[PDB]
Amino acid sequence: MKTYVPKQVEPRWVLIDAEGKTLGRLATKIATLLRGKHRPDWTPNVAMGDFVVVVNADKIRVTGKKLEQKIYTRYSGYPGGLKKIPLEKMLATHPERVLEHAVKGMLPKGPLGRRLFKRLKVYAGPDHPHQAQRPEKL
């Protein structure tokens, strides 16, 4: 008989930004990071993983054209309208989300993935006025 359990770790954050990347192609890696999928002391039920921080938001490439080609229905008020929003908008009118959303649909659906999304901390920087230990990853 065996067992393989980890005690109370210590959230080892990460500061990051590759605005030269394609969100998604990036987001994944971020998500992968979020939940401790890289750190070999796994426990899908625990909630241990990097406290990922992304700076210098946007500036993100995005392959082919999403000049209103990428729509964000996401919003369905309730009476008769399902308000749609193209990329351009979010970029101009407060971006960040752009990447945020990309991360949500990569993190699991439970109160955990919900909790994990609480880790991610993206800003439209550069500048992450919120850290005491940014371990910028490459």
Partner 1 sequence: PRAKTGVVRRRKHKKILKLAKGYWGLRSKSFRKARETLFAAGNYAYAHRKRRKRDFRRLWIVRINAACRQHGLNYSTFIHGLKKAGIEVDRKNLADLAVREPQVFAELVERAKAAQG
Binding site for Mg ion (CB under 5 A): 90
Positions in 28-47 near RNA (CB under 7 A): 43-45, 47
Per the DSSP assignment, residues forming a β-bridge with 15 are: 53
Strand 53-54 versus strand 121-122 pairing type: parallel
Using alpha carbons, list the distances in angstroms from residue 54 to 70, 83, 99, 138: 22, 28, 9, 12
Residues 104, 80: Cα–Cα separation, whole Å: 26
Tokens of 125: 């920087």
Which residue's CB is nearer to partner 1, number 28 or number 69?
Answer: 28
Choose, by CB under 8 A, the member of 19, 25, 29, 42 that binds partner 1.
42
Residue 47 binds which one of RNA, Mg ion, partner 1, none, with CB within 5 to 8 A depending on kind?
Answer: RNA
Which residue's CB is nearer to partner 1, number 3 or number 73?
Answer: 3
Strand 15-16 versus strand 53-54 pairing type: parallel
Interface contacts to RNA, rule CB under 7 A: 3, 5, 43-45, 47, 108-115
Interface contacts to partner 1, rule CB under 8 A: 2, 4, 37-42, 44
